Design a binder for this molecule. Structure first.
Ligand SMILES: C=C(C)[C@H]1CN[C@H](C(=O)O)[C@H]1CC(=O)O
Ligand SMILES: C=C(C)[C@H]1CN[C@H](C(=O)O)[C@H]1CC(=O)O
Lengths: 251, 251
C-alpha cells in the first residue's frame, strides 16, 4: 500500500517544527495538535503517510477574476495530496470543490483587540472608521465577510475591501502584531484567539462568536477516505482523545 | 431619591444566598456575579437599591394561550421593579416588551451530555429518538427552537413539544441531574455549561454554539435608566472589571 501524501501548513499549535539536538527525520520533524491527530488517524485506519507542507503556503481560496483555486484545497483538487490535515475551515465555497470529514474541532470568528477600551462588538467597529480592522487575506474569515448578506458584516467588508492592502494581512501573527502596535482590531478564529490571549495579557477577545464553524480533514472530492476519516474522528471524540489533544496543545 | 427595586433570581454563580456566621441583612444576604455587577452599577451611577427575588421564579416568557408575560420581564412591564439584574438573555421577543442595556456577557446555546459517546452535534440528536433531549421549559433556549426556521432545530422542537412534560425541565440543575442519571442531552447556555463541566468530569459540551446571544440588564421599556446602565457596563468592560468578575465566580 503506497503511503498517503498529507498536505499541511505551519500554524501554532497545530503544526510546528519539532525541536531537538539529535537529527529528526521524516514525519518526526513535525509536532502539534494536527500531527497528533494525523498519527491517530493512521493507526485507527491503518495507513502510512508522508507529511508535506503546502507548497504555495495557502489554505484555499478561489480567484475572483480567473476563478482558480489555490492552497491545500487546490492540491486536493489536482490529486497532488491525499489528505489535508490542518486548521482548515469547513465552508460552503470549499465544499463545492473538495470533501470534508466531520469536524474535529468547532469554533467561530471573533475579534482580537487590545484591552482597556469600550469597543465591545463588531457593530462598534462597523459604525466607525477610526480604528482599522481586517483579517488574513482570502482566508475563511475574510470570505465570510465578503459573502455576508448581514448589513453589519457587509459594511465591514466594504471597509476592508476599500483598504485591502492596508488592513488585510498574510498571517495570524501579522494580525496579532498589528493589534499590538496600532489602533487595529483583528478578525480571527476563536480557537487561535484563545491560544493568543492566554499568552499575552494585553490582548482580549471582543464580543462573542460572529459565526459557527469547524475544522475538518480535507480530501479530494469523492475520495473513499473522507468517510473513513469521519469514523476515526468520531472514535477519537467518544474516547476523549480530541479533548486530551486540545488540553495538551492549548494547556 | 427613592431606592430602585432590583429583581433577580437564584442561579449559581450569578446569584446565591451568602453564607455567614453572623446574621446578614438586606442586600448583604446575596452574592454572586450579578450581585457584584449590581453593586458596581450603583456606585458608578449613584443610586441606592433593594434586591428582591422575582416572586414567580421565572425569567420571562409569553403564554401561548392567553398571551400573558411572566417572570422578571412581567415585573418590569408592570413596573413592580426598576431593574432586572440576572442571567437574562437578550432576545427579540423580550425586546418587544422591555428594554435591555448592552450585554454584560456573551454566550450561546449548546449541548450538555455525558462523555464517552459518538454524539457530536445537534443534528445527531435531531435525527434520532432513543436519546431524549430538552431544555428549561419556556426559557430562552426552548423559545429559540420554538421560533426556529432551521430544519434541524424545527425538528428538535417538534420532538420536545410532543414530549413536553417528559423532556422539558424546571431548572438547569434538573437538566444536569437528568444528564447524569439517564440517557438524556440538555440544551443549555454555554456560560453555565462551562461552570458545570469544570465541576463534573463526567459531563462535556457537545458541538459548538447553536446561536449567539448575551445577558443584559432589563428595564421597563422607555426607562431612562437603560442607557445609563449601558454606560456603566461599557466602563466596567474597558476597566477590565467584567473579566475579573467572570474569573472570580467561574474560578
Ligand atoms: C491560519 C489561517 C490563515 C487559516 C486557519 N483557518 C482559516 C482557513 O481555513 O482559511 C484561516 C484563518 C482565518 O481565516 O481567520
Ligand atoms: C436559568 C434559566 C432558566 C435562564 C438563564 N438564561 C435563560 C433565559 O434568560 O431565559 C435561561 C436558560 C435557558 O433558557 O437555557
Amino acid at each position: 500500500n503506497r503511503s498517503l501524501i498529507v498536505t499541511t501548513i505551519l500554524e501554532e499549535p497545530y503544526v510546528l517544527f519539532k525541536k531537538s539536538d539529535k537529527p529528526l527525520y521524516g514525519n518526526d520533524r513535525f509536532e502539534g495538535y494536527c500531527i497528533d491527530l494525523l498519527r491517530e488517524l493512521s493507526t485507527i485506519l491503518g495507513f502510512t503517510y508522508e507529511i508535506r507542507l503546502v507548497e504555495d503556503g495557502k489554505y484555499g481560496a478561489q480567484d475572483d477574476v480567473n476563478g482558480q483555486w489555490n492552497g491545500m484545497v487546490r492540491e486536493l483538487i489536482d490529486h497532488k495530496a491525499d489528505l489535508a490535515v490542518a486548521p482548515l475551515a469547513i465552508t460552503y465555497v470549499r465544499e463545492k470543490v473538495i470533501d470534508f470529514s466531520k469536524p474535529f474541532m468547532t469554533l467561530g470568528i471573533s475579534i482580537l483587540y487590545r484591552k482597556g477600551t469600550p469597543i465591545d462588538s463588531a457593530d462598534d467597529l462597523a459604525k466607525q472608521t477610526k480604528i482599522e480592522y481586517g483579517a488574513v487575506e482570502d482566508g475563511a474569515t475574510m470570505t465570510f465577510f465578503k459573502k455576508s448578506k448581514i448589513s453589519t458584516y457587509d459594511k465591514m467588508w466594504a471597509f476592508m475591501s476599500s483598504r485591502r492592502q492596508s488592513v488585510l494581512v498574510k498571517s495570524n501573527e501579522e494580525g496579532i502584531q498589528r493589534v499590538l502596535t496600532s489602533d487595529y482590531a483583528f478578525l480571527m478564529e476563536s480557537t487561535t484567539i484563545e491560544f493568543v490571549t492566554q499568552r499575552n495579557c494585553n490582548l482580549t477577545q471582543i464580543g462573542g462568536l460572529i459565526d459557527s464553524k469547524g475544522y475538518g480533514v480535507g480530501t479530494p472530492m469523492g475520495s473513499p477516505y473522507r468517510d473513513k476519516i469521519t469514523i476515526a474522528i468520531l472514535q477519537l471524540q467518544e474516547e476523549g482523545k480530541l479533548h486530551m489533544m486540545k488540553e495538551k496543545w492549548w494547556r
